[PDB]
Amino acid sequence: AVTEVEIDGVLHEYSTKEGVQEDILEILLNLKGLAVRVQGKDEVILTLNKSGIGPVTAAD
Amino acid sequence: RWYVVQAFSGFEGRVATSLREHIKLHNMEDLFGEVMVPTGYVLVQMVMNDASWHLVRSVPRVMGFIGGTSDRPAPISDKEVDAIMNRLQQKTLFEPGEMVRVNDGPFADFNGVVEEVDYEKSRLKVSVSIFGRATPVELDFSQVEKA
Amino acid sequence: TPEEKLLRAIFGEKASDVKDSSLRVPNGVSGTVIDVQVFTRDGVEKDKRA
Numbered sequence: 269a270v271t272e273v274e275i276d277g278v279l280h281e282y283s284t285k286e287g288v289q290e291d292i293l294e295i296l297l298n299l300k301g302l303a304v305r306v307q308g309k310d311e312v313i314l315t316l317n318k319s320g321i322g323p324v325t326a327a328d
Numbered sequence: 329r330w331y332v333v334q335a336f337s338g339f340e341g342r343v344a345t346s347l348r349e350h351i352k353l354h355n356m357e358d359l360f361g362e363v364m365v366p367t368g369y370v371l372v373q374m375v376m377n378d379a380s381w382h383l384v385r386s387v388p389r390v391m392g393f394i395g396g397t398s399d400r401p402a403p404i405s406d407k408e409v410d411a412i413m414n415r416l417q418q419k420t421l422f423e424p425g426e427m428v429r430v431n432d433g434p435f436a437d438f439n440g441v442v443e444e445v446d447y448e449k450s451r452l453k454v455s456v457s458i459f460g461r462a463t464p465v466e467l468d469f470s471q472v473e474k475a
Numbered sequence: 476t477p478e479e480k481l482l483r484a485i486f487g488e489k490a491s492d493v494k495d496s497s498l499r500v501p502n503g504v505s506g507t508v509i510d511v512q513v514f515t516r517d518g519v520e521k522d523k524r525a
Contacts, residue, residue: 282509408518431518
């Protein structure tokens with residue numbers, strides 16, 4: 269499951285993003301329920317590079 | 329309504345009864361309901377009028393009324409709200425004998441006339457009115473405003 | 476005295492050797508900051524944040 273996350277544009281929670289409906293506290297919980305499988309390493313750092321008009325899937 | 333009668337410590341209480349002493353001499357009804365002796369400050373219940381003011385001017389001279397103006401107590405807005413209204417009105421042109429309104433330091437909420445205009449030192453020796461008298465103090469072109 | 480001309484650089488700040496406090500976080504209470512708001516009197520200057 270999800271533990272530590274660094275936002276590009278936000279440092280502390282309790283704020284509202286420019287051009288998003290869902291608040292950070294909402295999104296924190298969206299991340300909690302996300303499912304991950306790991307085989308190869310122990311701990312990894314990954315990135316969510318996304319832009320445009322469209323709904324955020326999960327794969328990208 | 330409540331008007332603050334300023335009196336002198338030691339005989340400050342004496343003024344509070346000297347109210348009630350002279351009240352009976354000039355007498356009719358009303359005006360004075362409940363004379364409070366709280367203590368330089370004597371709080372006195374009164375609705376505004378010409379009567380009782382003439383009495384105070386007949387027996388002084390230590391202190392008078394408190395608030396905003398001595399004739400008619402007692403407002404609450406002094407000179408900072410006046411310093412906000414001066415911004416719409418607007419000069420750095422200061423000379424001997426022009427009114428030079430202060431709004432910085434312990435000389436804030438107070439006005440004054442500039443005594444000395446220094447261009448080399450960039451100061452205005454603005455005479456602020458305190459204690460029925462004057463206080464000449466150097467305050468910057470910004471620490472003051474032209475009236 | 477001399478001692479004040481000899482105190483203006485241990486505390487290399489202000490005109491004199493004087494500094495105390497105002498108010499603090501209470502002991503036991505612990506939380507996170509969100510948004511701070513400033514209300515300084517018109518007449519005297521403000522800080523960087525204001």
